[model samples]
Target: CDAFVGTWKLVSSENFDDYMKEVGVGFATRKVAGMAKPNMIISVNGDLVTIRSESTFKNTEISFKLGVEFDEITADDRKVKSIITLDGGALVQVQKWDGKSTTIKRKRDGDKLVVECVMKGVTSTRVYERA
Candidate 1:
């Protein structure tokens, strides 16, 4: 996971509309989301990792360990319990709160890292590379 310890630029994303739909966001918010790009900066220190998601609209910071549990909130304000764990060579994350599920997995692909996220019944994936 040494390669994960750097600022990453958001190259592109998929299933954005479906994701917003699953999160119960309205069309007004979806318009804002579609127009903004996000940057994910991760600073890894052994098992503890600090992750920040920055965009022109909002910025959120989350800190957790490789196998420990932490708390976070969704874009729609749902309290979530997130856990990042090592699954073989990849980083596996699961966020659960208010009886809903949001799962994410991150792995390196060539010079980019692919992040796959699933929440409710919809899914979204984003890509990143060194910034």
Candidate 2:
């Protein structure tokens, strides 16, 4: 019940642009993610979960219950209806837009957090570690 309970700092990434390209991110905003080292803070209490992210570019915080749909505007500035569900010990996010959809899973690996995003056929992996 504690796979994701505290905070972590982003370590590295792979195929990050490929993941953003599939999402059709804004031209300037797409690569802007490459510049920021975002810190992720997650908290779970009872049935609700809170995930907070921070970086030099921007920051976002959202709180929702598992398996419930919530309205969210992503950092790439897209309004999407998304849901976060607990799968095994991972926090999975399913985000759907007008035509396409994206899925992200935050899973624990040793002392690291593996936040992987997949869209279309591209998969991007961003790793984070406990601080």
Candidate 3:
């Protein structure tokens, strides 16, 4: 959890558009999302955690206690129940929305943060550098 705290700038991504499509993102939204590079700020205090994503288009923030389920509305406007947990050196999240579920794993790789998002048979990996 401590390792995940800090501001990270998006550096690169793979298959993100496809993952967004699988998750029901509209064409216009996907196009905009693809062009934007977001900065993520993570904070951890005891069992409480917050992750803020900042971008030119929109900024989103989520805060929750570890292992606690909470309601979340995603940037794409999907309503979901989500839970986040620390597993080994990774921060893992499961989000359920409209009978579908997505899993996201965030881990530190060398000097960068690596995020893997999986949904509806598509997977996307995003890399972020410390800001």
Candidate 4:
């Protein structure tokens, strides 16, 4: 929790376009999304946490307690049921959408925040640096 509490700037991403397309994002949105490097702010207060993605295209925020299920609308406007949990000092987020599911894990590796996302067998890793 303490490890993720701060603002992070997107440094690099891999296969992000494929993951977006796999999740039903249109080509137009994907084009913009692919070019945008977003900054994320994570806040933790006791059992509650808020993660916000701020970018030129759109700003999205998700707030929930650890181990609690909640409704989530993705930055691309996809509706989903999501839950976030802590496992081995990393944040594991699972989202169920259109009867399918996706998982994202955020972990601190040295001085970088590493986010790994998997959807429909397509995986992408996005690295962020503290800002």
Candidate 5:
């Protein structure tokens, strides 16, 4: 979480609805989720990293170290096993459960932190910016 340690505002999202659908996200969850704008806060203390996502609809936060596996109740309320690691200049996060897996990649480019999520042949990219 070196270059990613900062507060970012969600500026754009692409193909998020389809991405949520691939996970079988509920209807109530899909509508609000597809429209919600969230703020991402990334921080690290010692060896542990904390990623906090805040939105008008709901909040999601997870704290863990690199390459460690942990359980997390996701923003969508899905019970998942999550693992995070750095790869090719980005953070590679894979959250898995019920035989399905999603990979979320976080990369920082200057003042922008771009996150791309992939699952079941669907991909969504969310763009965030900070001052």
Candidate 6:
């Protein structure tokens, strides 16, 4: 089952540049975001979960329980407070960083995993397949 756990390869990406800009990514940063291929690997063990996104410039890992709140460093290395909730079978995250808020809802679509983020007036979507 693709219930929010597994290593997923990024098959395609869209609107990421604008999404990065919303996250305070500058023009140079957006250029980098466009260049690198990012992949997300999620592992669930019991009530705890770990998600990691690997890219050329940065590798990020976020760990939290199903209903717990946690703090992690964002790509900017600033503190990002986050909370995870389960809606239906999907994992939803609301991240607060630099006084701004963004939400991402993740779930499975057919055999692929879909992640959509709404931030700073832009909505970016990334689709993934099992690796």
Query: Largest lDDT belongs to which candidate?
Result: 3
Q: Considering TM-score, which of the candidate structures 3 and 5 is the better prediction for this target?
A: 3
Whichever of 1 and 5 has more TM-score, that candidate is 5
Against the reference, the lDDT scores of all candidates come to 0.81, 0.89, 0.94, 0.92, 0.91, 0.83
Among the numbered candidates, top TM-score falls to 3
Residue 57 in candidate 5, Cα distance off native in Å? 2.2
Q: What are the candidates' C-alpha RMSDs?
A: 1.7, 1.1, 0.8, 0.9, 1.0, 1.7
> Candidate 1 at 98: error in angstroms?
1.6
Residue pairs clashing in model 1 are none
Ranking by TM-score: 3, 4, 5, 2, 6, 1
Comparing 4 and 6 on lDDT, the stronger one: 4
Off by over 4 Å in 2: none
Clashes of each: 0, 0, 0, 0, 0, 0
- Per-residue CA lDDT of candidate 2, range 1-131, in tens? 47788889989999998899888987688778888899999888888788989999899988898888999989988999999887888888999989778999999899889999999989999999986
**TM-score of decoy 3:** 0.97
Candidate 4 residue lDDT tens string, 12-51: 9999988988888899999989889999999987778999
Candidate 2 yields a Cα-based lDDT of 0.89
TM-score of each: 0.88, 0.95, 0.97, 0.96, 0.96, 0.90
What lDDT tens digits, residue by residue, belong to model 6 across residues 29-103? 678778877788998877778999999898999878877889978765668789989888788989897578999
Model 6 misplacement above 4 A: none
Alpha-carbon lDDT of model 1: 0.81
TM-score between candidate 6 and the true structure? 0.90
